[PDB]
Design an enzyme around this catalytic site. Sequence first.
Site, short mmCIF file in Angstrom:
data_model
loop_
_atom_site.label_atom_id
_atom_site.label_comp_id
_atom_site.label_asym_id
_atom_site.label_seq_id
_atom_site.Cartn_x
_atom_site.Cartn_y
_atom_site.Cartn_z
N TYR A 1 0.94 -1.12 -0.09
CA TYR A 1 0.01 0.03 0.04
C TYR A 1 0.95 1.33 -0.03
CZ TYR A 1 -4.07 2.93 1.26
OH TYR A 1 -5.24 3.82 1.21
N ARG B 1 -6.73 2.65 3.65
CA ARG B 1 -7.39 1.30 3.33
C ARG B 1 -6.61 0.12 3.87
NH1 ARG B 1 -12.11 1.69 1.11
NH2 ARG B 1 -12.83 3.53 0.11
N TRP C 1 -12.12 11.75 -3.99
CA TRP C 1 -10.52 12.10 -4.17
C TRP C 1 -9.80 11.92 -5.60
CZ3 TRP C 1 -7.76 13.70 -0.29
CH2 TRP C 1 -8.13 13.27 1.08
C1 LIG Z 1 -10.72 3.58 5.35
C2 LIG Z 1 -11.43 3.80 4.13
C3 LIG Z 1 -10.91 5.09 3.13
C4 LIG Z 1 -10.07 6.21 3.70
C5 LIG Z 1 -9.84 7.48 2.80
O1 LIG Z 1 -8.41 7.72 2.45
C6 LIG Z 1 -7.82 6.68 1.80
C7 LIG Z 1 -8.26 7.00 0.33
C8 LIG Z 1 -8.16 8.46 -0.25
N1 LIG Z 1 -6.46 8.64 -0.16
C9 LIG Z 1 -6.37 9.92 -0.67
C10 LIG Z 1 -4.89 10.40 -0.55
C11 LIG Z 1 -5.11 11.38 -1.85
C12 LIG Z 1 -3.92 12.20 -1.85
N2 LIG Z 1 -3.59 12.72 -3.14
N3 LIG Z 1 -2.42 13.13 -2.90
N4 LIG Z 1 -2.26 13.38 -1.62
N5 LIG Z 1 -2.89 12.68 -1.18
C13 LIG Z 1 -5.72 8.23 1.42
C14 LIG Z 1 -6.28 7.01 1.97
C15 LIG Z 1 -10.57 8.73 3.18
C16 LIG Z 1 -12.12 8.78 2.83
C17 LIG Z 1 -12.96 9.65 3.30
C18 LIG Z 1 -12.04 11.04 3.98
C19 LIG Z 1 -10.73 10.67 4.39
C20 LIG Z 1 -9.81 9.70 3.87
C21 LIG Z 1 -9.44 5.93 5.02
C22 LIG Z 1 -10.17 4.69 5.89
N1 LIG Z 2 -12.69 -0.49 -2.35
C1 LIG Z 2 -11.13 -1.02 -2.47
C2 LIG Z 2 -10.48 0.46 -2.90
C3 LIG Z 2 -9.41 0.32 -3.57
C4 LIG Z 2 -8.77 1.89 -4.19
O1 LIG Z 2 -9.37 2.51 -4.91
N2 LIG Z 2 -7.37 1.97 -3.85
C5 LIG Z 2 -6.58 3.08 -4.03
C6 LIG Z 2 -5.72 3.56 -3.27
S1 LIG Z 2 -6.72 3.85 -1.59
C7 LIG Z 2 -5.90 2.92 -5.54
O2 LIG Z 2 -5.12 1.94 -5.71
N3 LIG Z 2 -5.68 3.91 -6.38
C8 LIG Z 2 -4.86 4.16 -7.56
C9 LIG Z 2 -5.46 4.27 -8.77
O3 LIG Z 2 -6.76 4.09 -8.89
O4 LIG Z 2 -4.72 4.32 -9.81
C10 LIG Z 2 -10.29 -1.27 -1.15
O5 LIG Z 2 -11.11 -0.82 -0.18
O6 LIG Z 2 -9.34 -1.87 -1.34
#
Ligand SMILES: c1ccc(C(OC2CCN(CCCc3nnn[nH]3)CC2)c2ccccc2)cc1
Ligand SMILES: N[C@@H](CCC(=O)N[C@@H](CS)C(=O)NCC(=O)O)C(=O)O
Lengths: 198, 198
Positions: A7, A13, A103
Amino acid sequence: PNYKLTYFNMRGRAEIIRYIFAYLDIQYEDHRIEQADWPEIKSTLPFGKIPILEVDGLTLHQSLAIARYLTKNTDLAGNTEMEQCHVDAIVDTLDDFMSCFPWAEKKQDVKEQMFNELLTYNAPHLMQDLDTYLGGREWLIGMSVTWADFYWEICSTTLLVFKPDLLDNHPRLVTLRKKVQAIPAVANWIKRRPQTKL
Amino acid sequence: PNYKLTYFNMRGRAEIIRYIFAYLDIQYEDHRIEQADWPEIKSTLPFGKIPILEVDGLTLHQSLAIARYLTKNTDLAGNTEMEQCHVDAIVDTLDDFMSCFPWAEKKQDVKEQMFNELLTYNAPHLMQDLDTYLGGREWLIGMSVTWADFYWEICSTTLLVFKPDLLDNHPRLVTLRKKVQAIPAVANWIKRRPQTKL
Ligand SMILES: c1ccc(C(OC2CCN(CCCc3nnn[nH]3)CC2)c2ccccc2)cc1
Ligand SMILES: N[C@@H](CCC(=O)N[C@@H](CS)C(=O)NCC(=O)O)C(=O)O
Ligand SMILES: c1ccc(C(OC2CCN(CCCc3nnn[nH]3)CC2)c2ccccc2)cc1
Ligand SMILES: N[C@@H](CCC(=O)N[C@@H](CS)C(=O)NCC(=O)O)C(=O)O
Ligand SMILES: [Mg+2]
């Protein structure tokens, strides 16, 4: 078996999986990739998304599917099939909300507006529903901690970064968070894990 | 036990549950409510969402959590612990995409625009990943049908309404749809169920 979790360097996640490994006292490789390396990694994954968990070389995907896989047959799953359904339902209710945040929104204009709307309007409604669901009970499901409690603490921790007053009117939800954070194996992980915003 | 499924008069998120009941030859009350009768029911539910499945007086929520509960200890769940994880993962991957559609949009014009963009710019990548994942195998997971195959057929059926050529480049995914539709119990349900748009 040999476990390798991949990750980004964030809780995000993958954190629910990290909590489960910690609680069950299972050794694993916590592989955190750099954004510059993602492109190449992504092209090798069946569905191009992370987290993924490799078990003896076999790749598993979808954070909650993996979490359920790791907790089956353990005391974190739910004591009956019906209770296991309640655990899954609470987890999906929480995940549905977290997944609503755009996002990937192309327009930074709409993106900002949606985040504020979800935090100011939707978030409070969900907190109230969760508080009522929990009632005066110790844990969300059954009479012992389940991974649904872990996910609640994980999701709320990140939401609190965006909205610090989220739980000012729900002390029982705060107490639940503290109870999860106080679990020895979990407390130890929280203190040693990399400090990141998300 | 006695089962009562509550949802709108549409396939939507309740259809996966209806397919499972059909395949397993289990009787249940298919309670379909009109939009006007939703408000007074909504207020009685802990999270205010449907479908819900009442099982001997106790209420379950979250369509996929319910589907998983109903398939436990049956031939639809997956043949190994790892395959059960893959079933969950495929279902969540499909559900993740379905959940992206902005049904809450106000402007019907803008709404259609967003739907068309998701189906044109994003859906192709998912379809390709699913096709590659399936390869030349008969079912998505293992050597027998699972509820993941059911979910693929249900999701693709509705997406095809909005994007008729969705699978023109993926005949193998069409073949899978046909296989699910040919299972006697499922075929019978598809022919007798109420005809609705969604
Ligand atoms: C459980 C489920 C989903 C989340 C979310 O955070 C995840 C997905 C979005 N990710 C974005 C960072 C994007 C970014 N781009 N450039 N710099 N940063 C980080 C990890 C989530 C969903 C709703 C509100 C906040 C965070 C966390 C826990
Ligand atoms: N619902 C899926 C979400 C998977 C997901 O969207 N992962 C993101 C990072 S939080 C990712 O791989 N995004 C990179 C991309 O889409 O290129 C889970 O819980 O694993
Ligand atoms: C599996 C998962 C999700 C779906 C989606 O369909 C649902 C969501 C919204 N619902 C709104 C209809 C409101 C209405 N009332 N009267 N007319 N219209 C219909 C069912 C879904 C998501 C993405 C694309 C299409 C359908 C179906 C199956
Ligand atoms: N992920 C949940 C979604 C639940 C959901 O959003 N249901 C919609 C109907 S498709 C609903 O209850 N909306 C009516 C409302 O929110 O008042 C599931 O699969 O059950
Ligand atoms: Mg989900």
